Paper text:
To structurally characterise the mechanism of SOCS1 inhibition of JAK kinase activity, we solved the structure of Gallus gallus SOCS1, without its SOCS Box domain, in complex with the human JAK1 kinase domain bound to ADP, using X-ray crystallography (ggSOCS1ΔSOCSbox-JAK1KD). Attempts to crystallise a complex containing human SOCS1 were unsuccessful, however, the Gallus gallus and human orthologues share 72% identity and 89% similarity and display similar efficacy in JAK inhibition, indicating that it is a good model for the human protein. Crystals of a 1:1 complex were obtained and the data processed to 2.5 Å. SOCS1 binds to JAK using both its SH2 domain and kinase inhibitory region. The interface between the two proteins is 1159 Å2 and the KIR of SOCS1 is responsible for approximately half of this buried surface. The significantly improved resolution of the SOCS1/JAK1 structure allows a detailed atomic-level analysis of this interaction and shows that it is mediated by a continuous six residue segment of the KIR (His54 to Arg59), corresponding to residues −1 to +5 of this motif based on earlier definitions. The first of these, His54, is sandwiched between two planar sidechains from JAK1, the upper sidechain is from His885 in the glycine-rich loop of the kinase and the lower sidechain is Pro1044. Phe55 is the P + 1 mimicking residue and, together with Phe58, form the bulk of the hydrophobic interactions (with Phe1046, Thr1100 and Val1101 from JAK1) that wedge the KIR between the activation loop and the αG helix as well as providing three mainchain-derived hydrogen bonds. When bound to SOCS1, the JAK1 kinase domain adopts an active conformation, characterised by the activation loop displaced from the ATP-binding site with a DFG-in position, an intact substrate-binding groove and both the C-spine and R-spine26 aligned. The activation loop is in its active conformation and this is notable because Tyr1034 is unphosphorylated.
Residue numbers in the entry:
A (entry chain A): 868 to 894, 898 to 912, 918 to 946, 951 to 1153
B (entry chain B): 52 to 168
The structure:
Amino acid sequence: AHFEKRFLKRIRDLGEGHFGKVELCRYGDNTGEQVAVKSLKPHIADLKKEIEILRNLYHENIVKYKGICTEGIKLIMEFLPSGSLKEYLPKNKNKINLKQQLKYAVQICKGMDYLGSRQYVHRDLAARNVLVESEHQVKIGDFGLTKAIETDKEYYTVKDDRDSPVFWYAPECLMQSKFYIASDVWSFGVTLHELLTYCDSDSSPMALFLKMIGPTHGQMTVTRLVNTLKEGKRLPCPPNCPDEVYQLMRKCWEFQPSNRTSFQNLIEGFEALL
Amino acid sequence: STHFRTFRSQADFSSITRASSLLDACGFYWGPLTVSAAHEKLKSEPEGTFLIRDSTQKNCFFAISVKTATGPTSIRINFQTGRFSLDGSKETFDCLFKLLEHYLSSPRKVLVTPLRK
Ligand SMILES: Nc1ncnc2c1ncn2[C@@H]1O[C@H](COP(=O)(O)OP(=O)(O)O)[C@@H](O)[C@H]1O
Ligand SMILES: [Mg+2]
Ligand SMILES: [Mg+2]
Protein backbone atom coordinates (compact mmCIF):
# COMPACT_ATOMS: atom_id res chain seq x y z
CA ALA A 1 0.00 0.00 0.00
CA HIS A 2 3.13 2.17 -0.24
CA PHE A 3 3.84 3.59 -3.70
CA GLU A 4 7.30 4.93 -4.53
CA LYS A 5 7.56 8.43 -5.97
CA ARG A 6 10.34 7.25 -8.31
CA PHE A 7 7.92 5.13 -10.40
CA LEU A 8 5.04 7.60 -10.74
CA LYS A 9 4.38 8.67 -14.33
CA ARG A 10 2.83 12.15 -13.89
CA ILE A 11 0.97 12.05 -17.21
CA ARG A 12 -1.41 15.02 -17.08
CA ASP A 13 -3.88 16.81 -14.81
CA LEU A 14 -7.41 15.57 -14.08
CA GLY A 15 -9.13 18.31 -12.08
CA GLU A 16 -8.61 21.16 -9.62
CA GLY A 17 -10.69 21.62 -6.49
CA HIS A 18 -10.87 24.39 -3.91
CA PHE A 19 -8.39 22.52 -1.68
CA GLY A 20 -6.11 20.40 -3.88
CA LYS A 21 -5.12 19.22 -7.35
CA VAL A 22 -5.63 15.80 -8.94
CA GLU A 23 -3.34 14.41 -11.64
CA LEU A 24 -3.30 11.22 -13.71
CA CYS A 25 -0.28 8.93 -13.31
CA ARG A 26 0.85 5.34 -13.86
CA TYR A 27 2.96 3.07 -11.65
CA GLY A 28 9.81 1.94 -18.56
CA ASP A 29 7.60 -1.06 -19.32
CA ASN A 30 4.44 1.04 -18.68
CA THR A 31 2.92 -2.00 -16.97
CA GLY A 32 1.39 0.27 -14.32
CA GLU A 33 -2.30 1.08 -14.49
CA GLN A 34 -3.81 4.56 -14.51
CA VAL A 35 -4.10 6.16 -11.07
CA ALA A 36 -5.39 9.49 -9.76
CA VAL A 37 -2.97 11.26 -7.41
CA LYS A 38 -4.23 14.07 -5.16
CA SER A 39 -1.67 16.59 -3.91
CA LEU A 40 -1.99 19.36 -1.33
CA LYS A 41 -1.69 22.44 -3.59
CA PRO A 42 -1.23 25.17 -0.91
CA HIS A 43 -3.31 21.77 4.87
CA ILE A 44 -0.87 18.90 5.42
CA ALA A 45 -2.80 17.67 8.47
CA ASP A 46 -6.13 17.68 6.61
CA LEU A 47 -4.99 15.34 3.83
CA LYS A 48 -3.89 12.68 6.33
CA LYS A 49 -7.37 12.84 7.88
CA GLU A 50 -8.97 12.46 4.45
CA ILE A 51 -6.90 9.33 3.76
CA GLU A 52 -7.87 7.74 7.08
CA ILE A 53 -11.53 8.35 6.17
CA LEU A 54 -11.28 6.90 2.65
CA ARG A 55 -9.39 3.84 3.93
CA ASN A 56 -12.24 3.23 6.39
CA LEU A 57 -14.91 3.27 3.65
CA TYR A 58 -15.64 0.30 1.37
CA HIS A 59 -18.78 0.71 -0.75
CA GLU A 60 -19.68 0.15 -4.39
CA ASN A 61 -20.62 3.82 -4.92
CA ILE A 62 -17.51 5.26 -3.22
CA VAL A 63 -14.09 5.83 -4.78
CA LYS A 64 -11.72 3.01 -3.88
CA TYR A 65 -8.61 3.78 -1.85
CA LYS A 66 -5.27 2.72 -3.34
CA GLY A 67 -2.19 3.87 -1.43
CA ILE A 68 0.02 6.70 -0.22
CA CYS A 69 3.10 8.41 -1.68
CA THR A 70 5.42 9.78 0.98
CA GLU A 71 8.11 12.41 0.40
CA GLY A 72 4.59 15.53 2.19
CA ILE A 73 1.93 12.93 1.39
CA LYS A 74 0.08 12.19 -1.85
CA LEU A 75 -3.21 10.29 -2.02
CA ILE A 76 -3.55 7.58 -4.67
CA MET A 77 -6.96 6.27 -5.72
CA GLU A 78 -8.68 4.55 -8.62
CA PHE A 79 -9.01 6.54 -11.84
CA LEU A 80 -12.51 6.91 -13.27
CA PRO A 81 -12.16 8.06 -16.90
CA SER A 82 -15.50 9.86 -17.24
CA GLY A 83 -14.53 12.42 -14.59
CA SER A 84 -17.21 14.08 -12.48
CA LEU A 85 -20.83 14.81 -13.32
CA LYS A 86 -19.82 18.48 -13.63
CA GLU A 87 -17.83 17.41 -16.71
CA TYR A 88 -19.65 14.25 -17.82
CA LEU A 89 -23.20 15.62 -17.98
CA PRO A 90 -22.58 18.68 -20.24
CA LYS A 91 -20.88 16.37 -22.78
CA ASN A 92 -23.61 13.67 -22.83
CA LYS A 93 -26.85 15.64 -22.77
CA ASN A 94 -28.53 13.59 -25.53
CA LYS A 95 -27.21 10.29 -24.11
CA ILE A 96 -28.30 10.37 -20.45
CA ASN A 97 -32.10 10.27 -20.23
CA LEU A 98 -34.30 10.62 -17.14
CA LYS A 99 -34.15 6.93 -16.20
CA GLN A 100 -30.34 7.05 -16.20
CA GLN A 101 -30.44 10.17 -14.02
CA LEU A 102 -32.71 8.48 -11.48
CA LYS A 103 -30.30 5.54 -11.57
CA TYR A 104 -27.50 7.95 -10.65
CA ALA A 105 -29.64 9.41 -7.86
CA VAL A 106 -30.20 5.94 -6.37
CA GLN A 107 -26.47 5.12 -6.40
CA ILE A 108 -25.61 8.44 -4.73
CA CYS A 109 -28.21 7.83 -2.01
CA LYS A 110 -26.98 4.29 -1.33
CA GLY A 111 -23.44 5.63 -1.04
CA MET A 112 -24.49 8.50 1.22
CA ASP A 113 -26.67 6.22 3.35
CA TYR A 114 -23.69 3.92 3.90
CA LEU A 115 -21.60 7.00 4.71
CA GLY A 116 -24.16 8.02 7.33
CA SER A 117 -24.18 4.53 8.85
CA ARG A 118 -20.51 5.14 9.75
CA GLN A 119 -21.35 8.47 11.47
CA TYR A 120 -19.74 10.41 8.59
CA VAL A 121 -21.23 13.60 7.15
CA HIS A 122 -19.75 14.41 3.76
CA ARG A 123 -20.12 18.23 3.96
CA ASP A 124 -19.35 18.66 0.24
CA LEU A 125 -21.90 16.53 -1.64
CA ALA A 126 -21.95 18.21 -5.06
CA ALA A 127 -21.92 17.11 -8.69
CA ARG A 128 -18.26 18.14 -9.00
CA ASN A 129 -17.43 15.50 -6.36
CA VAL A 130 -19.59 12.70 -7.82
CA LEU A 131 -17.19 10.78 -10.06
CA VAL A 132 -18.45 8.78 -13.04
CA GLU A 133 -17.06 5.28 -13.56
CA SER A 134 -19.30 4.30 -16.49
CA GLU A 135 -22.69 5.09 -18.01
CA HIS A 136 -24.40 2.96 -15.34
CA GLN A 137 -22.13 3.54 -12.32
CA VAL A 138 -21.08 6.59 -10.31
CA LYS A 139 -19.01 6.94 -7.14
CA ILE A 140 -18.67 9.56 -4.41
CA GLY A 141 -15.33 11.20 -3.64
CA ASP A 142 -13.67 14.25 -2.07
CA PHE A 143 -13.74 13.69 1.71
CA GLY A 144 -11.55 16.67 2.63
CA LEU A 145 -14.37 18.25 4.66
CA THR A 146 -15.91 15.03 5.98
CA LYS A 147 -16.50 14.95 9.74
CA ALA A 148 -17.47 12.16 12.14
CA ILE A 149 -20.55 12.56 14.33
CA GLU A 150 -20.10 11.20 17.85
CA THR A 151 -22.13 8.06 18.47
CA ASP A 152 -24.09 9.75 21.27
CA LYS A 153 -24.58 13.06 19.42
CA GLU A 154 -26.96 14.02 16.63
CA TYR A 155 -24.61 16.49 14.91
CA TYR A 156 -21.04 17.80 14.83
CA THR A 157 -20.12 21.46 15.28
CA VAL A 158 -17.25 22.64 13.08
CA LYS A 159 -14.54 24.97 14.40
CA ASP A 160 -12.28 24.67 11.35
CA ASP A 161 -12.19 28.32 10.18
CA ARG A 162 -12.11 27.09 6.58
CA ASP A 163 -14.06 27.83 3.42
CA SER A 164 -17.33 26.03 2.75
CA PRO A 165 -19.57 25.52 -0.33
CA VAL A 166 -22.36 27.60 1.19
CA PHE A 167 -24.72 27.29 -1.80
CA TRP A 168 -25.01 23.54 -1.12
CA TYR A 169 -25.41 23.97 2.65
CA ALA A 170 -28.46 23.79 4.91
CA PRO A 171 -29.48 26.68 7.21
CA GLU A 172 -28.14 24.98 10.35
CA CYS A 173 -24.74 24.70 8.64
CA LEU A 174 -24.72 28.35 7.55
CA MET A 175 -26.01 29.83 10.81
CA GLN A 176 -24.33 27.60 13.40
CA SER A 177 -21.81 25.30 11.62
CA LYS A 178 -23.90 22.35 12.86
CA PHE A 179 -23.86 19.35 10.51
CA TYR A 180 -26.55 16.69 10.80
CA ILE A 181 -26.99 13.69 8.56
CA ALA A 182 -29.95 15.71 7.28
CA SER A 183 -27.43 18.38 6.26
CA ASP A 184 -26.12 15.97 3.62
CA VAL A 185 -29.74 15.34 2.58
CA TRP A 186 -30.03 19.07 1.86
CA SER A 187 -26.86 18.88 -0.25
CA PHE A 188 -28.28 15.90 -2.15
CA GLY A 189 -31.34 17.85 -3.29
CA VAL A 190 -29.03 20.55 -4.63
CA THR A 191 -26.88 17.90 -6.32
CA LEU A 192 -30.04 16.29 -7.73
CA HIS A 193 -30.91 19.71 -9.17
CA GLU A 194 -27.50 19.77 -10.86
CA LEU A 195 -28.03 16.25 -12.21
CA LEU A 196 -31.35 17.21 -13.81
CA THR A 197 -30.03 20.48 -15.25
CA TYR A 198 -27.06 18.53 -16.70
CA CYS A 199 -24.75 20.80 -14.65
CA ASP A 200 -25.58 23.90 -16.67
CA SER A 201 -23.55 26.93 -15.61
CA ASP A 202 -26.37 29.43 -16.13
CA SER A 203 -28.66 27.28 -13.94
CA SER A 204 -26.05 26.48 -11.29
CA PRO A 205 -27.09 26.65 -7.61
CA MET A 206 -24.87 29.70 -7.06
CA ALA A 207 -26.14 31.62 -10.10
CA LEU A 208 -29.79 30.95 -9.23
CA PHE A 209 -29.43 31.87 -5.55
CA LEU A 210 -27.49 35.04 -6.40
CA LYS A 211 -30.45 35.95 -8.62
CA MET A 212 -32.83 35.52 -5.68
CA ILE A 213 -30.51 37.44 -3.36
CA GLY A 214 -29.77 40.34 -5.70
CA PRO A 215 -26.62 42.46 -5.47
CA THR A 216 -24.25 41.05 -2.87
CA HIS A 217 -20.57 40.43 -2.17
CA GLY A 218 -18.29 39.56 0.72
CA GLN A 219 -19.26 37.43 3.69
CA MET A 220 -22.59 39.28 3.86
CA THR A 221 -23.56 36.99 0.97
CA VAL A 222 -23.88 34.25 3.60
CA THR A 223 -26.19 36.45 5.69
CA ARG A 224 -28.40 37.22 2.68
CA LEU A 225 -28.40 33.55 1.64
CA VAL A 226 -29.74 32.58 5.07
CA ASN A 227 -32.40 35.30 4.86
CA THR A 228 -33.40 34.01 1.42
CA LEU A 229 -33.79 30.49 2.80
CA LYS A 230 -35.75 31.92 5.75
CA GLU A 231 -38.19 33.37 3.18
CA GLY A 232 -38.96 29.86 1.91
CA LYS A 233 -37.12 30.39 -1.38
CA ARG A 234 -35.56 27.32 -3.00
CA LEU A 235 -34.17 26.32 -6.37
CA PRO A 236 -36.95 26.09 -8.99
CA CYS A 237 -38.09 22.90 -10.65
CA PRO A 238 -35.61 22.11 -13.44
CA PRO A 239 -37.03 21.99 -16.97
CA ASN A 240 -38.21 18.57 -18.18
CA CYS A 241 -38.29 17.34 -14.57
CA PRO A 242 -41.50 15.52 -13.58
CA ASP A 243 -43.42 16.56 -10.48
CA GLU A 244 -42.81 13.27 -8.66
CA VAL A 245 -39.05 13.84 -8.78
CA TYR A 246 -39.23 17.51 -7.77
CA GLN A 247 -41.37 16.66 -4.74
CA LEU A 248 -38.62 14.36 -3.48
CA MET A 249 -36.19 17.20 -4.19
CA ARG A 250 -38.25 19.59 -2.04
CA LYS A 251 -38.33 17.08 0.84
CA CYS A 252 -34.56 17.65 1.09
CA TRP A 253 -34.97 21.42 1.48
CA GLU A 254 -37.17 21.67 4.57
CA PHE A 255 -35.71 24.37 6.79
CA GLN A 256 -35.80 22.12 9.86
CA PRO A 257 -33.43 19.12 9.74
CA SER A 258 -36.07 16.98 11.47
CA ASN A 259 -38.61 17.70 8.70
CA ARG A 260 -36.34 16.49 5.89
CA THR A 261 -36.56 13.03 4.39
CA SER A 262 -33.88 10.39 4.95
CA PHE A 263 -31.66 8.70 2.39
CA GLN A 264 -33.47 5.37 2.77
CA ASN A 265 -36.80 7.06 2.02
CA LEU A 266 -35.18 8.70 -1.00
CA ILE A 267 -34.06 5.29 -2.29
CA GLU A 268 -37.62 4.01 -1.92
CA GLY A 269 -38.91 7.15 -3.64
CA PHE A 270 -36.72 6.85 -6.73
CA GLU A 271 -37.10 3.07 -6.96
CA ALA A 272 -40.88 3.51 -6.99
CA LEU A 273 -40.47 5.55 -10.20
CA LEU A 274 -38.41 2.87 -11.97
CA SER B 1 -16.21 33.32 -5.13
CA THR B 2 -17.65 29.85 -4.62
CA HIS B 3 -16.74 29.23 -0.97
CA PHE B 4 -17.25 31.33 2.17
CA ARG B 5 -17.07 30.79 5.92
CA THR B 6 -20.23 29.70 7.69
CA PHE B 7 -21.20 31.46 10.91
CA ARG B 8 -19.35 29.90 13.84
CA SER B 9 -22.34 30.08 16.20
CA GLN B 10 -25.90 31.28 16.61
CA ALA B 11 -24.59 34.12 18.78
CA ASP B 12 -22.33 35.24 15.93
CA PHE B 13 -25.26 35.10 13.51
CA SER B 14 -27.36 37.09 15.98
CA SER B 15 -24.61 39.72 16.13
CA ILE B 16 -24.52 40.24 12.36
CA THR B 17 -28.29 40.27 11.88
CA ARG B 18 -28.54 42.71 14.80
CA ALA B 19 -25.94 44.92 13.11
CA SER B 20 -27.60 44.57 9.70
CA SER B 21 -30.92 45.54 11.28
CA LEU B 22 -29.39 48.64 12.87
CA LEU B 23 -27.64 49.54 9.61
CA ASP B 24 -30.90 49.42 7.66
CA ALA B 25 -32.33 51.92 10.17
CA CYS B 26 -29.58 54.49 9.66
CA GLY B 27 -29.30 56.39 6.40
CA PHE B 28 -25.55 55.95 5.83
CA TYR B 29 -25.53 52.20 5.05
CA TRP B 30 -25.21 51.42 1.34
CA GLY B 31 -24.93 47.63 1.43
CA PRO B 32 -23.12 46.00 -1.51
CA LEU B 33 -21.04 48.99 -2.59
CA THR B 34 -17.69 48.15 -4.14
CA VAL B 35 -14.45 49.96 -3.33
CA SER B 36 -14.48 52.01 -6.53
CA ALA B 37 -18.20 52.78 -6.34
CA ALA B 38 -17.96 53.98 -2.74
CA HIS B 39 -14.89 56.12 -3.42
CA GLU B 40 -16.59 57.85 -6.36
CA LYS B 41 -19.45 58.93 -4.09
CA LEU B 42 -16.98 60.24 -1.47
CA LYS B 43 -14.27 62.01 -3.50
CA SER B 44 -16.41 65.17 -3.79
CA GLU B 45 -17.60 65.27 -0.16
CA PRO B 46 -15.99 67.36 2.60
CA GLU B 47 -13.09 65.75 4.44
CA GLY B 48 -14.20 63.30 7.11
CA THR B 49 -17.42 62.15 5.43
CA PHE B 50 -17.71 58.43 6.16
CA LEU B 51 -19.86 55.59 4.87
CA ILE B 52 -20.84 52.06 5.90
CA ARG B 53 -21.07 49.25 3.35
CA ASP B 54 -20.54 45.52 2.93
CA SER B 55 -16.94 44.44 2.50
CA THR B 56 -15.90 42.72 -0.72
CA GLN B 57 -13.52 40.23 0.91
CA LYS B 58 -14.72 36.71 1.66
CA ASN B 59 -13.69 36.81 5.33
CA CYS B 60 -15.06 40.27 6.22
CA PHE B 61 -18.61 41.51 6.79
CA PHE B 62 -18.63 45.33 6.87
CA ALA B 63 -16.22 48.10 5.94
CA ILE B 64 -16.02 51.87 6.38
CA SER B 65 -15.21 54.26 3.53
CA VAL B 66 -14.08 57.77 4.49
CA LYS B 67 -12.39 60.69 2.74
CA THR B 68 -9.08 61.76 4.28
CA ALA B 69 -6.49 64.32 3.19
CA THR B 70 -5.31 62.01 0.38
CA GLY B 71 -8.83 61.17 -0.80
CA PRO B 72 -11.38 58.39 -0.24
CA THR B 73 -10.06 55.29 1.52
CA SER B 74 -11.54 52.19 3.15
CA ILE B 75 -10.94 50.47 6.49
CA ARG B 76 -11.90 46.93 7.46
CA ILE B 77 -14.22 46.22 10.39
CA ASN B 78 -12.88 43.08 12.06
CA PHE B 79 -15.52 40.82 13.63
CA GLN B 80 -14.65 38.05 16.09
CA THR B 81 -16.95 36.36 18.63
CA GLY B 82 -19.56 39.10 18.68
CA ARG B 83 -16.85 41.77 18.94
CA PHE B 84 -16.22 44.51 16.38
CA SER B 85 -12.81 46.14 15.94
CA LEU B 86 -11.09 48.36 13.40
CA ASP B 87 -8.30 46.97 11.25
CA GLY B 88 -5.71 49.21 12.90
CA SER B 89 -6.99 49.36 16.47
CA LYS B 90 -7.21 47.33 19.68
CA GLU B 91 -10.64 48.56 20.85
CA THR B 92 -13.35 45.89 20.69
CA PHE B 93 -17.08 46.56 20.92
CA ASP B 94 -20.07 44.27 21.41
CA CYS B 95 -22.14 46.49 19.08
CA LEU B 96 -21.30 47.96 15.68
CA PHE B 97 -22.91 51.32 16.44
CA LYS B 98 -21.04 51.56 19.73
CA LEU B 99 -17.91 51.22 17.59
CA LEU B 100 -19.03 54.17 15.44
CA GLU B 101 -20.12 56.36 18.36
CA HIS B 102 -16.64 55.87 19.85
CA TYR B 103 -14.60 57.12 16.89
CA LEU B 104 -16.91 60.12 16.54
CA SER B 105 -15.22 61.22 19.80
CA SER B 106 -11.73 59.86 19.08
CA PRO B 107 -8.84 62.36 19.18
CA ARG B 108 -8.00 61.45 15.57
CA LYS B 109 -11.29 63.03 14.40
CA VAL B 110 -11.39 60.82 11.29
CA LEU B 111 -15.18 60.35 11.19
CA VAL B 112 -17.45 63.36 11.63
CA THR B 113 -20.35 63.38 9.15
CA PRO B 114 -22.09 60.38 7.53
CA LEU B 115 -23.09 60.19 3.87
CA ARG B 116 -26.81 59.44 3.75
CA LYS B 117 -28.89 58.04 0.90
N1 LIG C 1 -10.25 9.30 -9.21
C1 LIG C 1 -10.63 10.30 -10.04
N2 LIG C 1 -11.00 10.04 -11.31
C2 LIG C 1 -11.38 11.03 -12.15
N3 LIG C 1 -11.42 12.33 -11.80
C3 LIG C 1 -11.08 12.72 -10.55
C4 LIG C 1 -10.65 11.71 -9.58
N4 LIG C 1 -10.37 12.36 -8.44
C5 LIG C 1 -10.59 13.68 -8.66
N5 LIG C 1 -11.01 13.90 -9.92
C6 LIG C 1 -11.35 15.22 -10.50
O1 LIG C 1 -10.74 16.26 -9.73
C7 LIG C 1 -11.68 17.30 -9.46
C8 LIG C 1 -11.50 17.81 -8.04
O2 LIG C 1 -11.13 16.74 -7.18
P1 LIG C 1 -11.40 16.87 -5.60
O3 LIG C 1 -10.47 15.93 -4.86
O4 LIG C 1 -12.89 16.80 -5.37
O5 LIG C 1 -10.95 18.40 -5.34
P2 LIG C 1 -10.82 19.04 -3.87
O6 LIG C 1 -11.01 17.88 -2.93
O7 LIG C 1 -9.42 19.61 -3.84
O8 LIG C 1 -11.92 20.07 -3.82
C9 LIG C 1 -13.07 16.71 -9.65
O9 LIG C 1 -13.89 17.61 -10.41
C10 LIG C 1 -12.86 15.42 -10.42
O10 LIG C 1 -13.41 15.53 -11.73
MG1 LIG D 1 -14.03 18.77 -4.74
MG1 LIG E 1 -12.72 18.82 -1.41
